[PDB]
Design a protein around this ligand. Structure first.
Ligand SMILES: O=C(O)c1ccc2cc(-c3n[nH]c([C@@H]4O[C@H](CO)[C@@H](O)[C@H](O)[C@H]4O)n3)ccc2c1
Ligand SMILES: O=C(O)c1ccc2cc(-c3n[nH]c([C@@H]4O[C@H](CO)[C@@H](O)[C@H](O)[C@H]4O)n3)ccc2c1
Ligand SMILES: *Cc1c(COP(=O)(O)O)cnc(C)c1O
Ligand SMILES: *Cc1c(COP(=O)(O)O)cnc(C)c1O
Lengths: 810, 810
């Protein structure tokens, strides 16, 4: 049908049909009389999987023969979403599979909707890992993602009476056709025990053993026949575990709970023992696998020439002392040599500066669970502080600030300090964030070792986030500038030559309108809600957190409602305001924010005077597959975190690539997006980082804003008095009290500029031609935000390897 | 190579090779450079599985179209063993697969040894269910086996310092290629709650729900292209289960524990709540599936014309009140009509008379777990006793003896009484056992309803238990009388015409000698033990239980040792005495018996005066795959239970078919085996049932035997004084005390006759020609003990269906 989806040749279509029928019969054990739609989905998935396996085997053989430096990306989260369509895109099979299934009397889009998201992450951090795997394969790097195969991923969100309810995400219930269990590479992981000191050195003895069983998932690159591996570990009890008899077998569940469930926190450190076990489990299994692969080509001097380990925040920070443990205790390297190898092998990426997100583990927990690792950490600390003291003699407060060990009621280990000490490179994830690291939280470390500190601005894969989710846009671009941009996104700059082309302007606007109609129809069918598709689609989708300021958006929505009620017969640009995202189950204020959004919706959506001029919709169960539907349909992207809090953001980039304009603060990657597009093509408002600092020095007093802004005062009175909760008048008192007295994120301070800026958005939307010209200027300058650019920078500047766009043979 | 293994045609061999390579590449994702032997096993299993699926689909379609009466065999145990070789035998693929694998450079026998036993039973009861499934498919019955998919089957037995240690049987660790998950037929099962009485009738409300997910395994018939289904249920928590958040997800394990592990008891009722949950789980899921299939062809009058439910002991006895519950509470049938349907649908097979094996559930457990079922049981009881009182007016003691409710400190439900009341047929499993049922434990029931009571003597499948495990014997038989006997075992009678044929005598003896050499070599390789293969192989393999009298065998072994020590330079027929079997983990005396056997071995096997004249070997981890190796190698089969205790036995039959002579009591099916072969061709000894009864009336006094038999007294003194446990002199005091004062199974009473009978065995073994002639007379008359004969009798006399040997089209 459309060119970017590839060729549907007669021989390919015939072969796919015959393999589809083969899998239906032999793999699924069904015929066409009893087959369900889910059976047809599986028959297609197995058919497509067959095209991966030859390439997967050949890729891994190629790495064995050439022995390149291997890159190991360690993460507690990989937010993969669905695999079927992405695999077809990367193998150039989409049109052929569409035709094959069409000839069999089936609709491939319907079959795609049956697949479960692999929801093994919380949001941006986990999704970044997934984009990165795609880019590493597309750039021909010998890369492996290592994580945990959680039985239950991020919870499914239901809304009941306007409140979030959680249910378990039993994503493996029907099977996962993409993974391959590799029980033969099962490895032991040790916990508890104690340390014995012999004449041979230290020995970690009397431990409890849990087995780590790997499951491998293929990661195809874009049309280059490279298929890399994501290896995820699952916890298994040994067969003699606890071995009355029946209880001993039932108690195997205690060991196997390590891989049972993803902790559903975003930017919040809980400090639970089970989480620490997960972190060690992934590190310990991964490092043994790394060392095994290294030996199967004594001389650990070459280890950093053959191995790079990238730590995705501090969650796998135990890799540093575990590598030391293996090299010193088991391989018998001297301490100094082991440390040289460790530092040259490891690099650390920081993804947040929020104090509540930083991992600080109590010493008593580490002492019980990982006694040898605690000894190694103390020795690392003593040697590190010896260097600090030599560089800054007499600066005793610096020694306490830089220590890996924090004093207090409970002593804790600061895992970020450990990562900096044991890594040859430390990076932030957007220019402003990397600068904040050097100026504030890691200032002392930057002064000791300035050469370590780098920036690597985040990116997104244009395969999933343009070609897959928005084929109509991909196609109209390809008609003008060809297909090369899909693996070289900088080529989108060529679209600046079409900003005054009437045909291109029309086509850009038509694709958006089609995506809006398709999304409006999705909302009616799956959720029985009716929206005006000629309205401006104003979208804020991301996890619910005070720093992301969904509350500021709520204040604007109420403002627009109150303005309509005051002058009902005045024209206003119609909007559909859509907010979605999950709250962590223990985060009370986040749950109250969800309830506020649905309560505003209950009033606004049923007021006959408003009509279809304003609708407020809470999008339930926001996840990767829903992002693929709503992002292409958006007109306005809300990126409104308090300056200095969103380390980068990546949703911002997805919206830019898909033809939405951005309203946002000068935070994270928003700064660089505005720089690339031109500030005149971005709706920038609010305090800069420097203005937030100036308010903090004087002291933030929310009452001042309340006193001076009548429109704001009206909203707070409506919230307090029960206007949005008539049956429960005090329902929102916690929200009002927080805004008025304890607001760390200064919602009222940006209210006036935000509302004024929103008025400018409305003004531009009334001139469709000029709106669309501005959109073109955004799409055309989005090239920098390809994760292919990001990964090429990590490769050259951190890992010491050269990317390649060359194809392996088919 | 050998004819009974089928044809190896060039086209078949070529096709198997190409599919093997296809599965290695696409299914397993390996090439020949990295493939392990386990990978080759899986590639072969998938290749053979492909030949089943066309037949499986066609068989189930055929039943849908013809709508025959369906037979549902309900069991808590299916002791299947390995599937690969059995599948090849039943599809006539064995020689073709041997050739195909040979051409690929692989040894198929080595690959067969990689497969795990499906150990989902304890012993005879579970294995009988497996033989029965094979016979039902071979006889073309529309039959389904329904059970539980235990995650952990019967434990793996290790012997450490002569003691049994248990380890978990993690049989699913590498995957099971034979099963197919059917998550689409998942059904809810209810527990706890309470009963509400409305004007519409009773309602069971406020229940906890567990989901039952079915896994289907194909059951191929012998060369008839019929493939039936074994459906096993696995427990799953619903997604809203317990829905802080993390603990709620972890606590899903409480529901899922229902299918976690097989209770490892043989003939011993423990009475644990988890076991009751297992029993209801299997019944409730199965009955819904049955009713669904019945409706998918209001009128339950035809239900018993389309459905038969066979209850394998009382373990699924809750099927009776569950069927009543569904018909009365949900379908709104009147009680009397529902009862008529239930009785005509259900039939009960009893497999034991031991008092400690009979299920008697406390009322307080049923009241909490299954409150509606308890109400229905009480109503069944009241109506049943009303009939008893009308038939035997004034007989108040009969009313108390026959009640389903037993009075006492704790009130209990007698599940056997429930099964008799609610079934149209009740059978025992050997003639003597069925007679015991009518004369003793069910005498009252027999007097009320004599027409209900039947016999169905047990059998074994000649596919697994001759063709598969002893191809050399199958072949030499086929050379004389053709292949038809494999599905018509009565044809073995034709071998009586060869009892004086010198060539046949030679061949029978040669096959035994080959099997003995092969087994002697297996023992050296896997267990580092050396045996004389010219010795008489004296074998007792079965679960360890006081009633089976492994202790009587021990007394004979010590007797032979003491006789050698007394006259070292006298000739004695050399023996290798092999004893194997598992003890239930909580059964202390059974564990002590294992320790005694290994302790006797420690003395006997290292005495230089004995030499290779006597060896005592404990065969570790006895299970179906070990039975297939040792049974063909045996000369003497030990079947020495106290008369009246072994309901049938089936190991006895396996040994008879494979060319061993039997030493045994007139117990269970031993009576019928002796009748078929002629008493002159059997080594019968000991008390008959009537003699045991006479001793019980006078009172058993073990001291009398001790006082009168010097050889017995010497053994007891050796045990007591520490001769077999020099480091721990009192180790065996519990055994001595039991034998002398509390022996329910009268070991000393059969000692003299047993030893004398063993002397006659030795005498015959010295004349190989006459030994072999007697063997031929046993093999030739073993036809009655085919499970095909057993199943044909159930079909005609209980289920009301006609067996068929006709082939479905290929
Ligand atoms: O469960 C926990 O203990 C825990 C603790 C901290 C956590 C921090 C994060 C986390 N830190 N930074 C992040 C996000 O990472 C993205 C990719 O670079 C950034 O675009 C985004 O601005 C940032 O908020 N997520 C996620 C889960 C966590 C879970
Ligand atoms: O775990 C329990 O509660 C429990 C209770 C009773 C049990 C009884 C048996 C059981 N009863 N009879 C049997 C065996 O069934 C075979 C097939 O008909 C007979 O050949 C054999 O003589 C008999 O002992 N096993 C098995 C497991 C049990 C488990
Ligand atoms: C991209 C993405 C995120 C991150 O969005 P931000 O606006 O950068 O927080 C979160 N969740 C999902 C499902 C995503 O696809
Ligand atoms: C046949 C068999 C049994 C039953 O043997 P009996 O001697 O009848 O108790 C027990 N276990 C296994 C593994 C079997 O094959």
């Amino acid at each position: 049908q459309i060119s970017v989806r590839g060729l549907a040749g007669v021989e390919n279509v015939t072969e796919l049909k015959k393999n589809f029928n083969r899998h239906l019969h032999f793999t699924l054990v069904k015929d066409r009389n009893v087959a369900t739609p889910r059976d047809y989905y599986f028959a297609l998935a197995h058919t497509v999987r067959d095209h991966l396996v030859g390439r997967w085997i050949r890729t891994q053989q190629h790495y064995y023969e050439k022995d390149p430096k291997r890159i190991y990306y360690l993460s507690l989260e990989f937010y993969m979403g669905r695999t079927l369509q992405n695999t077809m895109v990367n193998l150039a099979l989409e049109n052929a599979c569409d035709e094959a299934t069409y000839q069999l009397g089936l609709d491939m889009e319907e079959l795609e909707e049956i697949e479960e998201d692999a929801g093994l992450g919380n949001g941006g951090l986990g999704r970044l890992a997934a984009c990165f795997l795609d880019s590493m394969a597309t750039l021909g790097l010998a890369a492996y993602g290592y994580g945990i195969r959680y039985e239950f991923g991020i919870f499914n969100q239901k809304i009941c009476g306007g409140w979030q309810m959680e249910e378990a995400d039993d994503w493996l219930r029907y099977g996962n056709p993409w993974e391959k269990a590799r029980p033969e590479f099962t490895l032991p992981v040790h916990f508890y025990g104690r340390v014995e000191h012999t004449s041979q050195g230290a020995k970690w003895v009397d431990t409890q053993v849990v087995l780590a069983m790997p499951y491998d998932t293929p990661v195809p690159g874009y049309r280059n026949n490279v298929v890399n591996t994501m290896r995820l570990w699952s916890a298994k009890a040994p067969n003699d575990f606890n071995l009355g008899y029946i209880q001993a077998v039932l108690d195997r569940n205690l060991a196997e709970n390590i891989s049972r469930v993803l902790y559903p926190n975003d930017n919040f450190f809980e400090g639970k023992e089970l989480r620490l076990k997960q972190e060690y489990f992934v590190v310990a299994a991964t490092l043994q696998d790394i060392i095994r692969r290294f030996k199967s080509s004594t001389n650990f001097d070459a280890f950093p020439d053959k191995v790079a380990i990238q730590l995705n925040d501090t969650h796998p920070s135990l890799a540093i002392p575990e590598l030391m443990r293996v090299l010193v205790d088991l391989e018998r390297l001297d301490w100094d040599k082991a440390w040289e190898v460790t530092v040259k092998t490891c690099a650390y990426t920081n993804h947040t500066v929020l104090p509540e997100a930083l991992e600080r583990w109590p010493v008593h927990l580490l002492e019980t669970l990982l006694p040898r690792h605690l000894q190694i950490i103390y020795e690392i600390n003593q040697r590190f502080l010896n260097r600090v003291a030599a560089a800054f003699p007499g600066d005793v407060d610096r020694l306490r600030r830089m220590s890996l060990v924090e004093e207090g009621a409970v002593k804790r280990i600061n895992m970020a300090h450990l990562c900096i000490a044991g890594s040859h490179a430390v990076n932030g994830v957007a220019r402003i964030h990397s600068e904040i690291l050097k100026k504030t939280i890691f200032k002392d470390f930057y002064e000791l070792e300035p050469h370590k500190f780098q920036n690597k601005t985040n990116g997104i894969t244009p395969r999933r986030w343009l070609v897959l989710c928005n084929p109509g846009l991909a196609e109209i671009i390809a008609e003008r500038i060809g297909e090369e941009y899909i693996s070289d996104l900088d080529q989108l700059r060529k679209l600046l030559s079409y900003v005054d082309d009437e045909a291109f302007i029309r086509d850009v606007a038509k694709v958006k309108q089609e995506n809006k109609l398709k999304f409006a129809a999705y909302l009616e069918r799956e959720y029985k809600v009716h929206i005006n598709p000629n309205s401006l689609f104003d979208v804020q989708v991301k996890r619910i957190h005070e720093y992301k300021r969904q509350l500021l958006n709520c204040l604007h929505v109420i403002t627009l409602y109150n303005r309509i009620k005051k002058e009902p017969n005045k024209f206003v640009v119609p909007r559909t305001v859509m907010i979605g995202g999950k709250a962590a189950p223990g985060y009370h204020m986040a749950k109250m924010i969800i309830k506020l959004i649905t309560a505003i919706g209950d009033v606004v959506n049923h007021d006959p005077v408003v009509g279809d001029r304003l609708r407020v919709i809470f999008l339930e169960n926001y996840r990767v597959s829903l992002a693929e539907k709503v992002i292409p349909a958006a007109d306005l992207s809300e990126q409104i975190s308090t300056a200095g809090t969103e380390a980068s953001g990546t949703g911002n980039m997805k919206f830019m690539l898909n033809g939405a304009l951005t309203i946002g603060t000068m935070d994270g990657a928003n700064v660089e997006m505005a720089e690339e597009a031109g500030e005149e093509n971005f709706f920038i408002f609010g305090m800069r980082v420097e203005d937030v600092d100036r308010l903090d020095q004087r002291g933030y007093n929310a009452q001042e804003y309340y006193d001076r802004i009548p429109e704001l005062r009206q909203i707070i009175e409506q919230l307090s008095s029960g206007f949005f909760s008539p049956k429960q008048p005090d329902l929102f008192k916690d929200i009002v009290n927080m805004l008025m007295h304890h607001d760390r994120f200064k919602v009222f301070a940006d209210y006036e500029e935000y509302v004024k800026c929103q008025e400018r958005v409305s003004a531009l939307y009334k001139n469709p031609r000029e709106w669309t010209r501005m959109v073109i200027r955004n799409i055309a300058t989005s090239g920098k935000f390809s994760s292919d650019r990001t990964i090429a920078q990590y490769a050259r500047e951190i890992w010491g390897v050269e990317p390649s766009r060359q194809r392996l043979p088919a």
